[PDB]
Nucleic acid binder design. Structure first.
Length: 205
RNA sequence: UUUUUUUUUUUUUUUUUUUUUUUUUUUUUUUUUUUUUUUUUUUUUUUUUUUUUUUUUUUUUUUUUUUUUUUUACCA
RNA sequence: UUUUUU
RNA sequence: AAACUGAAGAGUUUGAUCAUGGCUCAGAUUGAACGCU
RNA sequence: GCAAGCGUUAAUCGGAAUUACUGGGCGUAAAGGGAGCGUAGGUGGCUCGAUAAGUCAGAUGUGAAAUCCCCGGGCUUAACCUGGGAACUGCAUCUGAUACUGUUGAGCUAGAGUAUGUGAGAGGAAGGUAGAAUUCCAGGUGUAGCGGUGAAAUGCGUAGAGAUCUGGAGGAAUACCGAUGGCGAAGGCAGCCUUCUGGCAUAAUACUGACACUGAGGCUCGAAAGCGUGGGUAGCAAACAGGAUUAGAUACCCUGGUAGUCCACGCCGUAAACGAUGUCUACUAGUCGUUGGGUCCGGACUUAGUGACGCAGCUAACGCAAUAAGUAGACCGCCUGGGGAGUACGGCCGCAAGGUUAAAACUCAAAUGAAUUGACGGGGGCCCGCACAAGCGGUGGAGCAUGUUGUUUAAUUCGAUGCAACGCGAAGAACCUUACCUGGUCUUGACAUAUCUAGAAUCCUGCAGAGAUGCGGGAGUGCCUUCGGGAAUUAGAAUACAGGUGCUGCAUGGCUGUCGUCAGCUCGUGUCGUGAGAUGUUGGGUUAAGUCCCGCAACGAGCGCAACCCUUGUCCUUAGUUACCAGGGAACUCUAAGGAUACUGCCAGUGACAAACUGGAGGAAGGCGGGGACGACGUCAAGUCAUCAUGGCCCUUACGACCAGGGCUACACACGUGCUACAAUGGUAGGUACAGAGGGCAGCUACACAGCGAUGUGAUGCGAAUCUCAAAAAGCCUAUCGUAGUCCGGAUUGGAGUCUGCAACUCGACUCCAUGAAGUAGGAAUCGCUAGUAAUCGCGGAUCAGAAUGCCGCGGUGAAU
């Protein structure tokens, strides 16, 4: 526990906030609470389709939610009937129409959250942690990442003593502020406890 | 028995001349030390064996007892 | 000159 | 014609190593005993 | 896995090459006898013969049968029985062979010895002698110290020391030479001279003719200490005495000091007696020293020693390496896990001390060698950081605030505990928070889904009660679809369950501290090593930096460093309101976006023809311009299950849930952080200046009036570059106080109020009047700070109804070193 968040330290130099609205000092708190509610609802509902970058920007009441997923087809549904239900469920627990327009991740091996959640799903499927970690490294490296680091922390393989393991390939220079490093941290709820999964994908400058 | 020596702080020792209680070691609190020693700062601490007696005042002067040491306890 | 221990 | 056919190692000293070196084990055997059957 | 058996125990061999004949070792792991001489023994040169014992071959006799093995035969198969073979590695007697061993005859010279000439040497034994120096004694001069130590003190000295000079006595050792130099079997042996005496080295000739090597027992010699008798006795010095040091100091240091050390003659018989390496022989790259000879032309060669390197070979490695630990041979000694133990007992030796030979029980699964990586050292070298030093100001003493301990309580909720817990979680406990205590209560429950019964929810009410709660009365009849009805909704009908700040941070995730913003930490390939590993990453510089350059069996890479980010320092451009004011202006400040500049870029030197450093110019800025964020691999089973999430454990009319009151605020006490002071560089009373940043509808308030004041009423502007908080204080001028516990300090207490809030008793903050406590500069000890810093002065904000001396920021003045 001695490292800054890669996204947060880069929030203004090369990255952008995944929430772009403006409020007044009194309105801001309720905007933020509603935003966090929508985010947690979305991440629990669309847990099948591999969404990674839900972005909330609300211009004057009406909002424009933008989810980026690697599998837009399943979350949109047939002719677009799941997306309408999602639209109205968002609108119900926000103020007025939440236009959710859905992007597409054309390289799911370069997004850190998709890699981390894949490793997590494999871990909850009682797959060897070393093999899952190495598979993710290989997949990202041959998909074209300039660097990938993946850290697995916890009771790995049912071990009584938790340990931290990791693999790195490429550069992933955390201290460089202009590095374009995607980062994700998820948890796999195994049968022996929680295993934390951290993924750094360094893509350029 | 006897004659001398005395008995005081936790201990072992100083007083004292009627007008007061002492070092040292402790002990307690601090401080140095990772922590304990050592060390350094502070403190606390005496029915002066007891009991009559004299004095305005006694641990100190008298008398008794009581512990302590000694030294004696011999002749048939 | 004088630093014992765990 | 034949009597000419036979040879395995492991554990344990160290943070690790190689050596030394003891201890221990896997085999065969019995005029056997004991326990369960 | 075995199976009518399967396991255990006992016992033997195996594995164990762990007694090694096959088939081990002894430099450092256990192991070379202290060294020699030599007895028994073992082994042993060349040539020509003899013999035929060993040896080899053949034949014969025998080596019982059974068993083992081979080929078969009979039991239904098999076990079993059985025929014939093979074998029985042996012994005996004859015959043959003669390479080797034995026994012999003759011969030989190469191993080993002899005679003769030269040479070196601390080889040994006995005498004598010399010169320095110490000590002692006796004198002359001389006067107050000497001596000793890290300091001292003991000690010596005015009865005259020490110093200096002159005589005398005596003992021991032999500076310089002096040297991995010499000699000796080892132990050992140093002045010089004589005597007695051993070995060695060397050139040639002659001679003997295997006379040799090794060697159990045995004998001899054998450092130092020690023992006996008799002498000696200067210095040194066990013991011993005193002085110091120390917690102690039977020591180390100091001052003395006896045995002993010296001699003679004897004992002892042991040493890390070491090269931790038995002796002897042969052979096997080389290079450079040195000692004693010799031969040739200052060198060359050859010998016997004595050293340093270094192949092959050897070794576990270190290392050895013609002076082997290599390649072989002869003989001897020794080892067989660590302790017990080189001990006991018994012999033998000894005057004794003791030596020598040498077990066992028992006990433990190790004990060891060499090397590797770290860590550490009261090891070495180089370097950095407010680490010290140089300074400035504090803390530790007072009162108060706050946190913790302890104590006390019904409870004083829980966690944080060396740095890196203690104004920490908590960015703000009257109720709430709240997790604790007392009491009053509820049980699918305050909260989610499954469900079916009525109703739009929702609003207004009465009483009882501290409240949670309990019992009752009125208004409303939703909306879309419409007679199935639906997003919400109130009271349960029950099972699932919910709920748990209950436990385990030593089951965990996430998050954080810390070494430490220290400069490190690794990897791939290559190479080296049996290997753990190494190299890279080390070295010469250089840097803030594993920064950079150059070397280099390394070549490269990664995370760290730096840079990219924010802020500040100068300028330019766009823009000019609510900002600004030089002459409505578009100058300026400012505001807030985008850029410019700074790069060792230029100059001079130093530097390996480098990296780099030193100084200079220009510039607002000069070398990293200043400040921040950014915290490598990892370490502390570091902190957090009470933010959260979570594995497991635990409670489900209760450890869950609701309400009122109380507690978290108690104080013999102790500590940690602070604030206010102890005053004159100041207090007080008047004037008069100069900020920044931040907040404001969950509000800030112009102004007026009332009040001593906190505040209260009316009212105005402002979601703010507009209005406001708001006046900055320290500062400057004048007066006064005149060193006093005061005109310092402002705790504590009494009284009266204002606000916030349902509510100020426990337990709020301010205001006013009165009181006026300790405190006069703080022990041992200890902390922060290197420049706009410390010190000091005010001003904002988060949390927040109210409640900062804490936290987070802002500017003012502004050092010392």
């Amino acid at each position: 526990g001695q490292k800054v968040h890669p996204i947060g330290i880069r929030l203004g130099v090369v990255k952008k906030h995944n929430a772009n609205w403006y409020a007044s000092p009194k309105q801001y708190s309720e905007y933020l609470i509603n935003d966090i509610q929508v985010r947690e609802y979305l991440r629990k509902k669309l847990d099948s389709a591999m969404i990674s970058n839900i972005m909330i920007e609300r211009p004057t009441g009406a909002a424009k939610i933008t989810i980026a997923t690697a599998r837009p087809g399943i979350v949109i549904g047939k002719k677009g009937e799941d997306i309408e239900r999602l639209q109205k469920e968002l609108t119900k627990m926000m103020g007025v129409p939440a236009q959710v327009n859905i992007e597409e991740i054309t390289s799911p091996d370069l997004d850190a959250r998709l890699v981390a959640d894949g490793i997590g799903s494999q871990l909850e499927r009682r797959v060897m942690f070393r093999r899952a970690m190495k598979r993710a490294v290989q997949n990202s490296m041959r998909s074209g990442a300039k660097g990938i680091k993946v850290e697995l922390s916890g009771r790995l393989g049912g071990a009584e003593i938790a340990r931290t393991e990791w693999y790195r390939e490429g550069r992933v220079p955390l201290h460089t502020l202009r590095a374009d490093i995607d980062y994700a941290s998820v948890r796999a709820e195994t049968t022996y406890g929680t295993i934390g999964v951290k993924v750094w994908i360094f893509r350029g400058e």
